Design a protein around this ligand. Structure first.
Ligand SMILES: C=Cc1cc(N(C)C)nc(S(C)(=O)=O)n1
Lengths: 556, 415
């Protein structure tokens, strides 16, 4: 039926107007499948023919599809969606299995139809009109309009979830021990009542729902140990995710693909590594959501790797509030980090791979710190508390680092886990100039026009170099010159530069970098025993710098 | 209660929409606090439940005040403030008591309990939307909008300012010595009397506010004189190597952007040729002149530096190491209104984020007292870290704006 709830008022966007997209129909086939699906819905009260004529309109490309001889209408609200006011997303994300607690009894009611049982703001139905054509390529024709939350409309899950938390509030009041969680058409009902009393609440609730125009199936799905909520598999002692299969078809209607983005980004909350921010481009605007679309080289690649991650099922335990949460991280494939979150050993709640990397020149300690943060945020979101950490790093490696890092950093309570590759500092710069070391005066220069330059050095021992360069930029030859100095010198060296740029990077202490060059410098750096890098202002005629500057400058 | 007053109408800046700021996740301890609190507030008509037809939101969270206590709500109205900020008159009452910074002590009170009396303009309520989150997204968020003047809104002390002047008139008469500045949600109260006295004339003011129906906690103690600017200073040790002189020159060369009389050439003369870093250089007279000369410019404070009221105040912080933090407050590059340090850390406190959080507050209450404006911060931290931990040490009812930066090699040029 149709819930008696009070409707949510819905405005068209600030200064805007409804969809006047004319239908591109005529098929003489399936135009009969509609008017049958319509006239059924017209009776359930979900729609109704519009009197005093006009206007507005939305498409109705109905796709009966290989559902095994079915007739399905498919209003395309894509254009009406762009004119409907924004709504607030009242959740921070989709719930995560590991965040559930053990309950003696749980039931999962399937709200039947749902969007279809909540009425639409009366003043706003007008903009939801559509059309079914006929023989005579002229009206004739027929024109309906929605009285209830339409399928693809922009406001239909936000409004529907609001209508629901309303309808439940009374029932949650009389029953404070029952926990009801909603998520689309699925409603999870946990409880620590004896199997028998539970089933009775579950009946009282199904009646409340019904008095409010909401029907819930009594034959109940296929409820064995695999009870299904939000596509997770809940067992009294573990949850498991139904491996997702991404079927390969080239009948990739704009729809079929539009449905793929939905499934994939639902999965990224369980599976680490799903990318969908690619094939989205195979959309944008309005381009007939029946118009078979060809797989590109950019999307058909990734979608191909997607099937790979979803390949292997995932599962874990439930959360127990009396114990702490422990997070363990390990280093993997350079910039690849693995982590597990558990409370009792070997009994993981959630596992993941963090990659990202932050900056153009990072290193292991700062990269670890980034992971300790991302993991921390996750723990607050899912369980609302902070975990204790086990980390491949020594109290003294971390200690010397933060205590010699110009920025501010911090990790919560942690414990050294002596494990496989430890995280360590791959070299350190001297704080004082080294005595009896060849003091290298470095510098480069580039001509922003011709793109030519030179990089070179000058020492206090008469050693000199100047290299001519093609297709470089000033700040690149500043790093080039520093590299020279490194590679033409003993294990212990004093370099002196005028590039605050070049000095920034090196002082950070990167061990990995975007630029190959910085890597070569990194390599050279760790091969040395003692290195001290120094800065001085250009063009003050400071001894050493002045000579090097002049030398590389037949470009300037 | 909700005293029968005409809603003072209010309208955002032109061209602008109300706030739509995503909500940060909160710990369970905090969500419980915010659920209780709002529950009382909704009972008392102060706020109302709204649905998702209201596209506007504003982060909420909870802090545990200064020197321990029990939870308090705090609504991060930053986005709504700068979307509404300074409308017409009614603005920041008086152009800030230029005197207050001079007073021997200043005390802070939380008159925020006001504001819940005055209704809020109908057509604005929606812009005040805010949403308590859900652990693991189990239940939907619980959304409320405001019906009365909200605590962090800046438009609140403005609208209430007529009434606060009345309430206070009698007190400022019986006490024309004592200075009283309202900023946002606190009253800054500065006398010259002796501690025991001043702290007495504060309670009188609390009871005086009670007798007019305001009610306060039942902040800090602040000693404005003794916020001494920190003058840039050069190394003293005699035994200059080619290094020491090079640092010396680079610093003076930068510091010559602040003080235009500074000269370097006699020090570059000592460095002619391609010498090694370690090599000790005899300080020539002409140099030791330039150095004593220069040393004695870095002494006298600067001239040509005047607060400009229509311009934002900026504030940079640099981590200096031994629990020490240096900061400068300025409005155009190199023209510093103030510069200070902040220290006092060891053992059960050492925690970059905590110290940086404390410094950010102290710097900010210096600015309120000195100019009646909060500074837009340049924080030497990483977005993620900072956003991850700040509400754990915050104890103030306002929130300055901030940006995230990589401190340059100028940590050196200050200390
Ligand atoms: C495509 C959306 C979507 C949505 C969804 N939910 C929201 C349970 N589940 C799936 S599934 C069956 O593929 O795991 N997909």
């Amino acid at each position: 039926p149709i819930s008696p709830i009070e409707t949510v008022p819905v405005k068209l966007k600030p200064g805007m107007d409804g969809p006047k997209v004319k239908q591109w129909p005529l098929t003489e086939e399936k135009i009969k499948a509609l008017v049958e699906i319509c006239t059924e819905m017209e009776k359930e009260g979900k729609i109704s023919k519009i009197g005093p004529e006009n206007p507005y309109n939305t498409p109705v490309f109905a796709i009966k599809k290989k559902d095994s001889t079915k007739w399905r209408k498919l209003v395309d609200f894509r254009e009406l969606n762009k004119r409907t006011q924004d709504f607030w997303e009242v959740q921070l994300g989709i719930p995560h299995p590991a965040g559930l607690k053990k309950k003696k009894s749980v039931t999962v009611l399937d709200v039947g139809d749902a969007y279809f049982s909540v009425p639409l703001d009366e003043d706003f139905r007008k903009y939801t009109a559509f059309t079914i054509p006929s023989i005579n390529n002229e009206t004739p024709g027929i024109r309906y309009q929605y009285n209830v939350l339409p399928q693809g409309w922009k406001g239909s899950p936000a409004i529907f979830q609001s209508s629901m938390t309303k309808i439940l509030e009374p029932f949650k009041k009389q029953n404070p021990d029952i926990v009801i969680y909603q998520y689309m058409d699925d409603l999870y009902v946990g409880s620590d009542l004896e199997i028998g009393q539970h089933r009775t609440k579950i009946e009282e609730l199904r009646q409340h729902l019904l008095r409010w125009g909401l029907t819930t199936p009594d034959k109940k799905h296929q409820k064995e140990p695999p009870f299904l909520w939000m596509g997770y598999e809940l067992h009294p002692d573990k949850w498991t995710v139904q491996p997702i299969v991404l079927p390969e078809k080239d009948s990739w209607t704009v729809n079929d693909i539009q449905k793929l983005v939905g499934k994939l980004n639902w999965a990224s909350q369980i599976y680490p590594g799903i990318k969908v921010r690619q094939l989205c481009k195979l959309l944008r605007g309005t381009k007939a959501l029946t118009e078979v679309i060809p797989l590109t080289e950019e999307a058909e690649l990734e979608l191909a790797e997607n099937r790979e991650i979803l390949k292997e099922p995932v599962h874990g335990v439930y959360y127990d509030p009396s114990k702490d949460l422990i997070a363990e991280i390990q280093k993997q494939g350079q910039g690849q980090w693995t982590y597990q979150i558990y409370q009792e050993p070997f009994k993981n709640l959630k596992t993941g791979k963090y990659a990202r990397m932050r900056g153009a020149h990072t290193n292991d300690v700062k990269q670890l710190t980034e992971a300790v943060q991302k993991i921390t945020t996750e723990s607050i979101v899912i369980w609302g508390k902070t975990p204790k950490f086990k980390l491949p790093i020594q109290k003294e490696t971390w200690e010397t680092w933060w205590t010699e890092y110009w920025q501010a950093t911090w990790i919560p309570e942690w414990e050294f886990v002596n494990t496989p590759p430890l995280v360590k500092l791959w070299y350190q710069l001297e704080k004082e100039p080294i005595v009896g070391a060849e003091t290298f005066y470095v510098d480069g220069a580039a001509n922003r026009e011709t793109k030519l330059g030179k990089a070179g050095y000058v020492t206090n021992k008469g050693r000199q170099k100047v290299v001519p360069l093609t297709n470089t930029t000033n700040q690149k030859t500043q790093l080039q010159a520093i590299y020279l100095a490194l590679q033409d010198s003993g294990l212990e060296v004093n370099i002196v530069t005028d590039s605050q740029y070049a000095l920034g990077i090196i002082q950070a202490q990167p061990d990995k970098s975007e630029s190959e060059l910085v890597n070569q410098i990194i390599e050279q750096l760790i091969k040395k025993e003692k290195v001290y890098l120094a800065w001085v202002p250009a063009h003050k005629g400071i001894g050493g710098n002045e000579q090097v500057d002049k030398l590389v400058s037949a470009g300037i | 209660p909700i005293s029968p007053i005409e809603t003072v109408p209010v309208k955002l800046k032109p061209g602008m929409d109300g706030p739509k700021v995503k909500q940060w996740p909160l710990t369970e301890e905090k969500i419980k606090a915010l659920v209780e609190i709002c529950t009382e507030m909704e009972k008392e008509g102060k706020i109302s439940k709204i649905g998702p037809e209201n596209p506007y939101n504003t982060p909420v969270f909870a802090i545990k005040k200064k020197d321990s206590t029990k939870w308090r709500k705090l609504v991060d109205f930053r986005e709504l403030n700068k979307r509404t900020q300074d409308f017409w008159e009614v603005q920041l009452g008086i152009p800030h008591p230029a005197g207050l910074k001079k007073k021997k002590s200043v005390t802070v009170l939380d008159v925020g309990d006001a504001y819940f009396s005055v209704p809020l303009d109908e057509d604005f309520r929606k812009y005040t939307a805010f949403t308590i989150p859900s652990i693991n997204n189990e239940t939907p968020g619980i959304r409320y909008q405001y019906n009365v003047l909200p605590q962090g809104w800046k438009g609140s002390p403005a609208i209430f300012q007529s009434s606060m002047t009345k309430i206070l008139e009698p007190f400022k008469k019986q006490n024309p010595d004592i200075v009283i500045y309202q900023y946002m949600d606190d009253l800054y109260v500065g006398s010259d009397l002796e501690i025991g006295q001043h702290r007495t004339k504060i309670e009188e003011l609390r009871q005086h506010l009670l007798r007019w129906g305001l009610t306060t906690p039942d902040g800090y103690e602040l000693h404005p004189d003794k916020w001494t600017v920190q003058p840039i200073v050069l190394p003293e040790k005699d035994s200059w190597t080619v290094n020491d002189i090079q640092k010396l020159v680079g610093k003076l060369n930068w510091a010559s952007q602040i003080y235009p009389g500074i000269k370097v050439r006699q020090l570059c003369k000592l460095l002619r040729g391609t010498k090694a870093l370690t090599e000790v250089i005899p300080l020539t007279e002409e140099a030791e002149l330039e150095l004593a000369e220069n040393r004695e410019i870095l002494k006298e404070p600067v001239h040509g530096v005047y607060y400009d009221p229509s311009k934002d105040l900026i504030a940079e912080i640099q981590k200096q190491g031994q629990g020490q933090w240096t900061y400068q407050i300025y409005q155009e590059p190199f023209k510093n209104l103030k510069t200070g340090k902040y220290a006092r850390m060891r053992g059960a406190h050492t925690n970059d984020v905590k110290q940086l959080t404390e410094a950010v507050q102290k710097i900010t209450t210096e600015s309120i007292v000195i100019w009646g404006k909060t500074p837009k911060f340049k924080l030497p931290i990483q977005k993620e870290t900072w956003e991850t931990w700040w509400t754990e040490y915050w104890q103030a009812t306002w929130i300055p704006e901030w940006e995230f930066v990589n401190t340059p090699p100028l940590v050196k040029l200050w200390y």
